[PDB]
Amino acid sequence: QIVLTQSPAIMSVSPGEKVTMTCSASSSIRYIHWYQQRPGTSPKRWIYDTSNLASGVPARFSGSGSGTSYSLTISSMEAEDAATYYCHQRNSYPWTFGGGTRLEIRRTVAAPSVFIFPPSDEQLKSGTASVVCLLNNFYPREAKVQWKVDNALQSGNSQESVTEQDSKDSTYSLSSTLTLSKADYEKHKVYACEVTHQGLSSPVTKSFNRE
């Protein structure tokens, strides 16, 4: 029943910056514990007993707190710190966790490289055609892909997905898949992918003709 609130739900931070996230409990506890998780992977113990660094945790991390108010601080943010941080208390049954605090590292604006893929011959025998537009390595996250078949703007016809923020170059990448039946795919010719991004002066368009 002990609820743990973490004040900055999501927060963007610049490299080298000092950032502190908080964890406030609904009642007094004796020790807070911290766990770091990167998307897809399992949580790793980061700080136990409110202030003790777990083995392997870099010295730039530190934790403080008392009774109900607790905090985690990284001295100078790095790229490999972009992750989600959960606070945890085992003071009273049931043991509970916090809502999590996610940190994304700030980067210079970067424009995407735009590739386009025609449907494979193997999928065209299946009866359906999927064209895939690839936006590679861009920042910030906001990006507008828009499909156009014979310069006709498609709508409700495609789905996109975005990678988690890289920790090498900290850029995002996006894959947008436009799907049509083999009948409609051969009914038209020019398939285009129009991209709009902060780092682009003009909207860029990659395309191809069927054949």
Binding site: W95, Q123, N136, S173, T177
Partner: protein, 219 residues
């Protein structure tokens, strides 16, 4: 090193029961308690409970006491969690966490993804994303693989049996209007190596035991 190995992904029917295993190695099994944590996209992390392998004593989040029986087998350093009368709210990722009886959790298992659905499993189709010159942008080319119409999550995608890693982007799955999943993996590669080096994407959808290695060559 401490290692907690959990059983593989599961597709399970509503109202049925199922069991997750967690095999521990690298430490004395009886000296630490085994904990279980649920992570769903509706409640995030929840402590289910723990078991003491020495005497089989358990401590429960009262929300899960009648739901998640906890058992152990000292013979094989293995802990079990059962899930009875499964509903859609039990669809989540489940972790086992080692923990000394008086300390907090330190080591976590890799996680077991459980999907509760009346639908039958479906393996993906793997299609190539061939590198053209519409896929080249200054001496570098992009190729990939499209794995489509599978259920349920997850799938593992590797390139050249784990050799190719840099430049690889495995996008998160998207839920199609058919109710099936689709994702794409892509690699950025020097186009100097397209005519010479060969690129294989390796796909493994365990719930349906679909194993497909496909070669993506240009044209």
């Amino acid at each position: 090193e401490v290692q907690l190995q959990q059983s593989g992904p599961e597709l399970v029917k509503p109202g049925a029961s199922m069991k997750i295993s967690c095999k521990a190695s690298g430490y004395s099994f009886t000296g630490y308690t085994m904990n279980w944590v649920k992570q769903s996209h509706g409640e995030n992390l929840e402590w289910i409970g723990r078991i003491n392998p020495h005497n089989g004593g358990t401590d429960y989040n009262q929300k899960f006491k009648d739901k998640a029986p906890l058992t152990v087998d000292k013979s094989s350093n293995t802990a079990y969690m059962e899930l009875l009368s499964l509903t859609s709210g039990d669809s989540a990722v489940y972790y086992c966490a080692r923990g000394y009886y008086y300390y907090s959790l330190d080591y976590w298992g890799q996680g077991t993804s459980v999907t509760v659905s009346s639908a039958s499993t479906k393996g993906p189709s793997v299609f190539p994303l061939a590198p053209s010159s519409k896929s080249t942008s200054g001496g570098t080319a992009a190729l990939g693989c499209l794995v489509k119409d599978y259920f349920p999550e997850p799938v593992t995608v590797s390139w050249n049996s784990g050799a190719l890693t840099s430049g690889v982007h495995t996008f998160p799955a998207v839920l199609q209007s058919s109710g099936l999943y689709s994702l794409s993996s892509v690699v950025t590669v020097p186009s100097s190596s397209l005519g010479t080096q060969t690129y294989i994407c390796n796909v493994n959808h365990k719930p349906s035991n679909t194993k497909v290695d496909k070669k993506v060559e240009p044209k």
